[PDB]
Write a protein that binds this DNA or RNA. Structure first.
Ligand SMILES: [Mg+2]
Ligand SMILES: [Mg+2]
Ligand SMILES: [Mg+2]
Ligand SMILES: [Mg+2]
Ligand SMILES: [Mg+2]
Ligand SMILES: [Mg+2]
Ligand SMILES: [Mg+2]
Ligand SMILES: [Mg+2]
Ligand SMILES: [Mg+2]
Ligand SMILES: [Mg+2]
Ligand SMILES: [Mg+2]
Ligand SMILES: [Mg+2]
Ligand SMILES: [Mg+2]
Ligand SMILES: [Mg+2]
Ligand SMILES: [Mg+2]
Ligand SMILES: [Mg+2]
Ligand SMILES: [Mg+2]
Ligand SMILES: [Mg+2]
Ligand SMILES: [Mg+2]
Lengths: 125, 56, 91
RNA sequence: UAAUGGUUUAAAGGAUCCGUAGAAUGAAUUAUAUAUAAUUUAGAGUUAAUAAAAUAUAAUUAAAGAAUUAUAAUAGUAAAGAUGAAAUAAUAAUAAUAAUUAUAAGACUAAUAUAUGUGAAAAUAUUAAUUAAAUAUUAACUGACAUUGAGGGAUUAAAACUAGAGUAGCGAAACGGAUUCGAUACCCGUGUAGUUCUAGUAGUAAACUAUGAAUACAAUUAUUUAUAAUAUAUAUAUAAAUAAUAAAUGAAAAUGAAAGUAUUCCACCUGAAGAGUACGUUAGCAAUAAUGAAACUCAAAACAAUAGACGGUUACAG
């Protein structure tokens, strides 16, 4: 199954805000690939202000580093990834949505599919 | 009953691919793509492994 | 000067009639005054708060189909996308 | 001496579907005596392909959001709350109410929205995932394998019960304050059970479209809705739904593709009251649920419509 994760990583280190998101992506990608998975995209969204002052665990956030990860993995490991995301202080919000592959093996992320690039092959041409 | 068990076991075999693919055909097809590209190695192994993981 | 509402600006290169120089024309203009109104699937914009913040109110209430003018399918998809965006910490 | 009947509203559709028997019913051609046989694909199915969000439904797991209540603080001051107006044994000088923060807990799901839809019905609209089901059209395949369905089975709102958790709000009962001739009520305050979750029991609702299911057919229009084209235009064709109808039916109201024309199968009704009562039986922890009489009494009783009268009924004028 193809899945699209959209994480909202915290940025406490002001001088290098991307520092957290990089190691988040590294951890999740390592898990996926070591569990017979594949990572198709790690599309970075930017630093953005959250709509509200969201309180993950016992610390309040007003902004976060948004990032998207498109990855092919099985249901069990996808649940495991969601579990690790939900119990990580670094992550404020997380969400994994399926991308249906009944038509096409190759499919771009939601952002590129919205821009018009239906599959990764268009995105690389 | 033998039939149900054999069918389920054949489903559970390794290198079994979904969406009507066969591993023998897939390997031969990938080799044919590479030979045709020549006629007109670890990176190709990674491409093969990615394909087999997606189609597993 | 006069209020711009009471006056009519005839565009450039357009034909006109004497009727156009009248309050009837302005009144008739008042009475007879996009991305989702297309093949695009609104459910692909669930991670794009800027696009689908156009189809909500200042307080965030999804606009009725009478307002958005979308098809029933695209109204349903847009509402689903907006709710999903609200759930995933965007919006 | 009326069934040459009925069941939306007069008595009467089973809550729903699944399905067993049916001494119920049920396609086509040919041959031989209603059957047998061989053939066929129009019903009913299976598997793919293609298109579409098969998004909605069911279970499970993981999340989000506004608010409420309580607790603690901060500053600030005399009232607050409720009502038609007031008052409450437990609002406030022990600093309340209001405001601003911070913690905690339950329950619920604003907009979209039409329940459009999905589901057999009951139900079901905050998000995500897993699993399961559900669409149309083509291709190929089976060759009547179908329909309905007594008994039976399964599921089944709200209330209720048995255990164990939870209990913020709401709130039977109870206790008080009002109102009143009286209050046993409406209104106000505390508020137990319940409402929540887990495992069960129970199987009832105006479980309603007050309308059982299937099949064949019948004149139009307008909308959508979903496909298939053809080059926004064909006011584009083919389906379903919705709305208004023709005909038909009907006591009418009205129904309207069924309450029409027909066929098949099942359920149910036979004046009112006694009575969904008593007794018995079965089931259930119970509450109860199912099944379900008779005597006695009467010439009633009901439905639709008509014209008034009336209304602490609307609007408009004068
Ligand atoms: Mg007779
Ligand atoms: Mg009645
Ligand atoms: Mg009746
Ligand atoms: Mg019924
Ligand atoms: Mg009934
Ligand atoms: Mg809503
Ligand atoms: Mg049946
Ligand atoms: Mg309900
Ligand atoms: Mg209960
Ligand atoms: Mg208990
Ligand atoms: Mg409680
Ligand atoms: Mg109360
Ligand atoms: Mg009274
Ligand atoms: Mg009370
Ligand atoms: Mg039960
Ligand atoms: Mg009862
Ligand atoms: Mg009943
Ligand atoms: Mg009748
Ligand atoms: Mg009884």
């Amino acid at each position: 199954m193809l899945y699209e994760l959209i994480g909202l990583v915290r940025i406490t280190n002001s001088n290098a805000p991307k520092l957290e998101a990089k190691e988040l992506s590294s951890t999740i990608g390592k898990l996926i690939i070591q569990n017979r998975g594949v990572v198709r995209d790690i599309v970075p969204m930017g630093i953005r202000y959250l709509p509200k002052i969201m309180k993950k665990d016992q610390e309040k956030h007003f902004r976060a580093y948004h990032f998207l990860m498109l990855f092919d993995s099985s249901a069990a490991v996808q649940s495991e990834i969601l579990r690790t995301l939900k119990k990580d202080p670094r992550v404020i919000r997380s969400s994994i949505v399926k991308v249906d592959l009944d038509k096409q093996l190759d499919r771009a992320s939601s952002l590129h599919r919205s821009l018009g690039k239906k599959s990764i092959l268009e995105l690389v041409n | 009953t033998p039939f149900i068990t054999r069918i389920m076991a054949e489903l559970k075999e390794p290198l079994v691919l979904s969406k009507g693919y066969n591993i023998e055909e897939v390997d031969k097809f990938l080799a044919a793509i590479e030979s045709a590209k020549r006629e007109r190695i670890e990176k190709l192994e990674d491409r093969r492994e990615a394909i087999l993981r997606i189609l597993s | 000067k006069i209020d711009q509402s009471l006056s009519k600006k005839l565009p450039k290169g357009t034909i006109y009639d004497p009727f156009d120089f009248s309050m009837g024309r302005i009144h008739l203009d008042r009475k007879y005054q996009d991305i989702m109104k297309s093949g695009a699937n609104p459910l692909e914009f669930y991670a794009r708060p800027r696009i689908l913040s156009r189809y909500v109110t200042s307080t965030g209430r999804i606009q009725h189909r009478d307002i958005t003018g979308l098809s029933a399918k695209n109204q349903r998809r847009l509402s689903k996308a907006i709710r999903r965006c609200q759930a995933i910490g965007l919006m």
